[PDB]
Amino acid sequence: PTYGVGHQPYRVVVLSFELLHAPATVCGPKKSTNLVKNKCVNFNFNGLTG
Amino acid sequence: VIRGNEVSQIAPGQTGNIADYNYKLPDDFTGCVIAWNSNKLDSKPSGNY
Amino acid sequence: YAWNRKRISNCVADYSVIYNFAPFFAFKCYGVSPTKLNDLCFTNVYADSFVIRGNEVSQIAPGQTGNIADYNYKLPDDFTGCVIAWNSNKLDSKPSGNY
């Protein structure tokens, strides 16, 4: 504890996300909506819209 | 847990001591790096070995 | 106003030992990367030493104005090299005042 401020310990947490074509096994708290077809609308599938 | 001189070494495309022998980030890394000081819990008067 | 300038010439410089010598946050370089100073090598190395206030650490930059950079120590507009800055609270502080 008597050292300088540049030599203090640091707790480092490394979090990495997989961004591939795999289905989303684990992800965040978002709400899903019932599916309808044959209309000019906006969709949202696994994080990507259109 | 590492020292405060190697916080900048946790980066893609970086070399040094920790980045060259201990923990190397990939060149296509997608994620976040979180670091904060732990002087209250990771310090001893006789030395933390 | 009277900052020291030390000329370093005709030796071999190992730049990996600076981190174990002073407790500084950023090994702030401008035109070079810190970890590739061993492979390439320069012609001459200059060493300067001064102590300023905490509000003028950001004034150590090319193309900067203020009080230090306008009357005391102006860096050139094409400056390259590394700048080392660390605090001296445990070495240059007095209870009556460091005058």
Curated annotation (Swiss-Prot), chain C:
Q: Disulphide bridges in this chain?
A: 29-82
Which residue stretches belong to region Integrin-binding motif? 53-55
| Tree of life domain | Viruses
Q: What does this protein do?
A: Attaches the virion to the cell membrane by interacting with host receptor, initiating the infection. The major receptor is host ACE2. When S2/S2' has been cleaved, binding to the receptor triggers direct fusion at the cell membrane. When S2/S2' has not been cleaved, binding to the receptor results in internalization of the virus by endocytosis using host TFRC and GRM2 and leading to fusion of the virion membrane with the host endosomal membrane. Alternatively, may use NRP1/NRP2 and integrin as entry receptors.
What does the annotation say about its assembly with partners?
A: Binds to host ACE2. RBD also interacts with the N-linked glycan on 'Asn-90' of ACE2. Cleavage of S generates a polybasic C-terminal sequence on S1 that binds to host Neuropilin-1 (NRP1) and Neuropilin-2 (NRP2) receptors. Interacts with host integrin alpha-5/beta-1 (ITGA5:ITGB1) and with ACE2 in complex with integrin alpha-5/beta-1 (ITGA5:ITGB1). May interact via cytoplasmic c-terminus with M protein. May interact (via N-terminus) with host bilirubin and biliverdin, thereby preventing antibody binding to the SARS-CoV-2 spike NTD via an allosteric mechanism.
Please report the name of this protein according to its UniProt entry: Spike protein S1
**Species of the source:** Severe acute respiratory syndrome coronavirus 2
Q: What is the lineage of its organism?
A: Viruses, Riboviria, Orthornavirae, Pisuviricota, Pisoniviricetes
Chain's gene name: S
Q: Which residues of the full protein are shown?
A: 351 to 449 of 1273
